[PDB]
Design a protein around this ligand. Structure first.
Ligand SMILES: OC[C@H]1O[C@@H](O[C@H]2[C@H](O)[C@@H](O)[C@H](O[C@H]3[C@H](O)[C@@H](O)[C@H](O)O[C@@H]3CO)O[C@@H]2CO)[C@H](O)[C@@H](O)[C@@H]1O
Length: 627
């Protein structure tokens, strides 16, 4: 084991050291060691399917370096036990594939919700349902719900029991301007035990009456990451003569991939390009965009009177995963058991690669994405809108303030997967896409003379690509700008990881790009030199946005009154902290308050679980490819 594999082991040891507190008492990883953090989850001991996917990934690499596949198996075991809803959590009955859901608009601001159901709006057909049921013999949807309250901090428990750990919750529901600060956290299982008279439902969806019900939301990027990780575990185990220990677990990734196809469809199964909410619904695959959209979701009445499934009309390049798609399409170990699963993934692979290329800026960074539902209401695109198989270009799909593609992180996370795919296949389009993007990366990363480094933090965009017709035009009017710089260590490591796979590819298939290998190695070494600490690695970050703890009003309709499980009153006027008063018991609360009352930006050195994973994985990757 070389220097870099040893680097992985040390961080792995930190991560798995019970005293460091990366995991709860059940072995579920938290979002971060530190509880006082707000960014996508709003509390550090929540967890995400993202974290679970990174957990699978870390252990897959451990198996590679180690020959020991127990960690990978227990990772998967935990994932399936807690993060995928069980038969009891999702008792789906009376699903209609010809009427998968009923439509509701999306609106520009949270104060426009609850969104009214519109019962006359045509909805298309779900062509997956029957095939899946036939294949698996079950109505259970095999995907991770995205958000978990690991230690029941909020207090909803499981299935409304108020007590259990590993509690399913949700937050984001109120359109493109509901920031992490502007949500009302609510249980996935709704029995009206909390909130108002109709639980939390009528903050979000307006109906004539309300039924007790469950609903879950998949984050397609996380499920695909897990599949991606399992692909590598599969080839690594095979290399060692250990495939058989893992076989039933590659089967988990295969089945997860089978259900992940829901991410490939328009929200309400409307035809691509329809631009009319009153247009008739699609009849099958005419509503598939074949990309990994922002979510899929599914729900059911507790009494079993009905159920529903939706995809998403909004697609971000940051979610795509050609490695997982390739694996599911082409690798005989990974192919889903359904008749059309592998075929659908072959279509998605090609469509994804076209999407990346279509979105590539004049400089080389990848632009945001596209939607099949302009303003989330199937409206007519403005004149001159660039399109991709009938979908409209959006610089910032889904979230507009701040825009979802203003975060540099997606460049790394997503291009890392393309880089893997190119390494595996030599795909010329991926190679060309990566070469331009690497060129851009090399031009914006700062390797300072004094041994420090900075990576882009925030990006800004202007123009649009040329409408897609199968060939990259150079997109000379689509521009990126680096707004500012930071030392996000998770993203730094991810970026190193992508650069290394690309480099290994060019050696295997073209002219070895040594410069890319060296850029990555520098990032990994300068980081190792500078940022190690007791629990792993961390870099200081000021979080001036944390004034929103105290200042951010949460929209609540006039006259609507409810309560959180801890007794916090939910009504018009409440602040972020008013519906989360347990935050006041946080060890770092005095620090936050002192910073705030003194008008100063509090400063943190966080250990985010995914970030520590990316660091560990990136170092191991150098060993694996250049060892
Ligand atoms: O939603 C995408 C993922 O975001 C992750 O958090 C990021 C925050 O969104 C981002 O604002 C923050 O940026 C830091 C940066 O790390 C730091 O170097 C700089 O000094 O300050 C910025 C804060 O203004 O970084 C993190 C990126 O890790 C979540 O961790 C993740 O769950 C989520 O998917």
């Amino acid at each position: 084991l070389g220097e870099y594999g040893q680097r992985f082991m040390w961080l792995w040891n930190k991560i798995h050291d019970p005293a460091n507190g990366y995991f709860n008492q059940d072995g579920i990883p938290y979002h971060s060691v530190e509880t006082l953090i707000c960014e996508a989850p709003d509390y550090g001991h929540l967890t995400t399917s993202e974290a679970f996917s990174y957990y699978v990934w870390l252990e897959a690499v451990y198996g590679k370096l180690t020959g020991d596949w127990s960690k990978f198996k227990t990772a998967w075991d935990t994932l399936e036990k807690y993060m995928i809803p069980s038969a009891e959590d999702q008792p789906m009955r009376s699903y209609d594939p010809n009427k998968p859901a009923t439509y509701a608009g999306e609106w520009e601001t949270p104060d426009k919700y609850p969104s009214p159901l519109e019962f006359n709006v045509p909805v298309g057909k779900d062509p997956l349902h029957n095939e899946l049921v036939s294949t698996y013999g079950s109505t259970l949807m095999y995907g991770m719900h995205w958000l978990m309250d690991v230690d029941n901090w909020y207090g909803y428990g499981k299935r409304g029991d108020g007590v259990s750990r590993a509690s399913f919750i949700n937050t984001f529901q109120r359109g493109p301007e509901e920031s992490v600060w502007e949500t009302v956290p609510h249980p996935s299982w709704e029995e009206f035990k909390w909130g108002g008279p109709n639980g939390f439902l009528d903050l979000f969806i307006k109906d004539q009456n309300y039924s007790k019900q469950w609903r879950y939301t998949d984050a397609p990027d996380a499920d695909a990451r897990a599949i991606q990780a399992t692909y590598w575990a599969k080839v690594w185990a095979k290399e060692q003569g250990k495939f058989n220990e893992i076989s039933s677990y590659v089967a988990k990734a295969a089945k997860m991939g089978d259900y992940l196809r829901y991410a490939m469809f328009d929200k309400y199964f409307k035809p691509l390009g329809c631009q009319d909410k009153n247009a008739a619904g699609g009849t099958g695959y005419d509503s598939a965009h074949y990309l990994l959209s922002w979510y899929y979701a599914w729900g059911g009445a507790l009494d079993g009177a009905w159920s529903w499934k939706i995809g998403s009309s909004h697609v971000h390049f940051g979610y795509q995963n050609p490695m997982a798609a390739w694996a599911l399409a082409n690798d005989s170990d990974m192919k889903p058991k359904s008749p059309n699963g592998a075929s659908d993934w072959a279509k998605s692979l090609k469509r994804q690669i076209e999407f990346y290329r279509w979105l590539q800026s004049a400089e080389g960074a990848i632009a945001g994405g596209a939607t099949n539902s302009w303003n989330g209401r199937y409206e007519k695109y403005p004149a001159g809108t660039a399109t991709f198989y009938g979908m409209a270009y959006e610089p910032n799909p889904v979230y507009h303030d701040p825009g979802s593609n203003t975060w540099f992180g997606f460049q790394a996370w997503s291009m890392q997967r393309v880089a893997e795919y190119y390494y595996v296949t030599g795909d010329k389009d991926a190679g060309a896409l990566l070469e331009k993007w690497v060129s851009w990366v090399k031009s914006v990363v700062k390797l300072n003379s004094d041994g420090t480094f900075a990576i882009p933090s925030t990006l800004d965009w202007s123009g649009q690509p040329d409408t897609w017709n199968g060939a990259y035009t150079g997109n000379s009017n689509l521009h990126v700008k680096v707004v500012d710089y930071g030392t996000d260590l998770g993203i730094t490591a991810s970026l190193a990881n992508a650069l290394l796979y690309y480099s290994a590819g060019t050696k295997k298939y073209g002219v070895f790009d040594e410069g890319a290998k060296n850029l990555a190695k520098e990032l990994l070494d300068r980081m190792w030199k500078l940022y190690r600490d007791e629990k792993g690695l961390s870099a200081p970050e000021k979080r001036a946005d944390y004034k929103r703890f105290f200042e951010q009003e949460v929209y609540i309709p006039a006259g609507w009154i409810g309560k959180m499980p801890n007794g916090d009153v939910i009504k018009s006027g409440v602040k972020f902290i008013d519906i989360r008063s347990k935050y006041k018991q946080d060890p770092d609360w005095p620090k936050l308050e002192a910073a705030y009352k003194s008008g100063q930006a509090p400063e943190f050195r966080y250990h985010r679980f995914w970030a520590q994973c990316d660091i560990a994985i990136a170092n191991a990757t150098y060993e694996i490819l250049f060892g």
